[PDB]
């Protein structure tokens, strides 16, 4: 039936669209996490140097 097939197709496309957004939502959150962690790790490694050199002085 026409209406039946058309319904099933629009159903599929919407199901696909929602899953796709879900994955791009996870991907987005992940790539933000990499940048945040790179920045934190940079600061941590700078702190390790300062603390090490402080101990050799003190």
Count the residues of the shown chain that bind a copy of itself, applying the rule CB under 8 A.
35
Positions in 7-26 near a copy of itself (CB under 8 A): 8-13, 16, 19-20, 23-24, 26
Is residue 30 close enough to count as binding a copy of itself by CB under 8 A? yes
Which 8-state DSSP code applies to residue 58? -
> In the structure encoding, which two tokens stand for residue 36, read together?
């945040």
**Interface characters, 38-57, with a copy of itself (x: CB under 8 A):** x-xx--xx-xx--xx-xx--
- Please tell me the distance from the alpha carbon of residue 17 to that of residue 9, in angstroms, as a whole number: 12
């Amino acid at each position: 039936s026409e209406v039946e097939v058309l319904k099933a197709l629009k159903s599929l496309f919407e199901h696909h669209k929602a899953l796709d957004e879900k994955v791009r939502e996870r991907l987005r959150v992940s790539l933000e996490r990499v940048s945040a962690l790179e920045e934190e790790l940079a600061a941590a490694n700078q702190e390790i140097v300062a603390l090490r050199e402080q101990n050799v002085h003190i």
